[PDB]
Amino acid sequence: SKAAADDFKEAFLLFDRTGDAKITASQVGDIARALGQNPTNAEINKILGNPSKEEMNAAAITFEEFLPMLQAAANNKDQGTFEDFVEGLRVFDKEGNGTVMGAELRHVLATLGEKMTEEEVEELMKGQEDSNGCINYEAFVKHIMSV
Amino acid sequence: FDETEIEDFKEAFTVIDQNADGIIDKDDLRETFAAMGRLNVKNEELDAMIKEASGPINFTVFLTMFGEKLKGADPEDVIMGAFKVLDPDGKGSIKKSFLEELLTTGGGRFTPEEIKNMWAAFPPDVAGNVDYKNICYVITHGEDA
């Protein structure tokens, strides 16, 4: 709305590697996340196809399409409730203390639903899981929601 | 301030005071930095060092400025004294979680956030509290050795 945030246009100049002021359709998922929006990858996929837009063939972009797609994704930020994120992992391990065994969270984050690479899974556990093999998800989900 | 530490500051004062008159001026600062390899040392860095004093940098003004910045400076033998009391059986570097708990639970200076900053350049072993001794080195003489 501007509140006209012109820093979204300045961040589009940091993600366009050619400097022509266009951003390919394959970068739009990760740049919506870097502007403070977390649409799921199936949602980013649907919307695209919904609009008869094929992410399979070469794509370019213009700021005039990327701005309204970020504004259509911005209504879905009401789905980011931290009660359900901590209660999900609290149902994932027994006893009254928030600890996932290391390999349980790593294999679930790579193979269940939207596949996260094991390189990204190791980069998200690095520091929050110590050598006991127990990830405290009270501080883990706190630090994941700090970015 | 022990007397050998004051003699070390007298030797550093003589190496920066290349005119040997007893007062380090801005030309001495620039010519000591140029003799260490700093060809691009700006005049604003020399002016910020002189702006920390109220007068000319003679030996007692340099000692009082270093005294007021190093009000908790501890020599390596007293830091290893305290770490030998924390590891009273000798040889072993003490655990990471033991130093985090004992810093917090004894004193407010050992609060956590500060403990994350301790681990942050004082690497793992040092941070963790396992090694020992390298941290005493870098507290008496900074930067990576």
Binding site: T40, Q79, D84 | -
Partner: protein, 98 residues
């Protein structure tokens, strides 16, 4: 452990000493509804993750920024130098020093 994943009704089944028990066709119906309900619940929980996942990649990419350059340029030098008289000289000589 397997049934851990899937946007499936964790109701509709039941385990026991030699086997699992499973519904069809009602309980079968239940689950299905359930299944959709996790895509929601799930699909949404996936996203953030996905999102977040890459959000850490940027923090790394960025850190890396210079360490590369350092590496980048640094090599190039050598490729140029290693063939230079003066540099070979310094090389054989670099040792006699102290």
């Amino acid at each position: 452990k397997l049934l851990g994943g899937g946007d499936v009704d964790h109701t509709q089944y039941a385990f026991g000493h030699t086997k699992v028990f499973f519904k069809a066709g009602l309980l079968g119906l239940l689950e299905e509804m359930r299944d959709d309900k996790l895509a929601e619940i799930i699909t949404a929980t996936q996203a953030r993750c996905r999102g977040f996942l890459m959000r850490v990649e940027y923090r790394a990419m960025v850190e890396r920024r210079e360490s590369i350059f350092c590496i980048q340029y640094n090599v190039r030098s050598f490729m140029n130098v290693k063939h230079w008289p003066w540099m070979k000289l310094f090389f054989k000589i670099k040792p006699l020093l102290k």
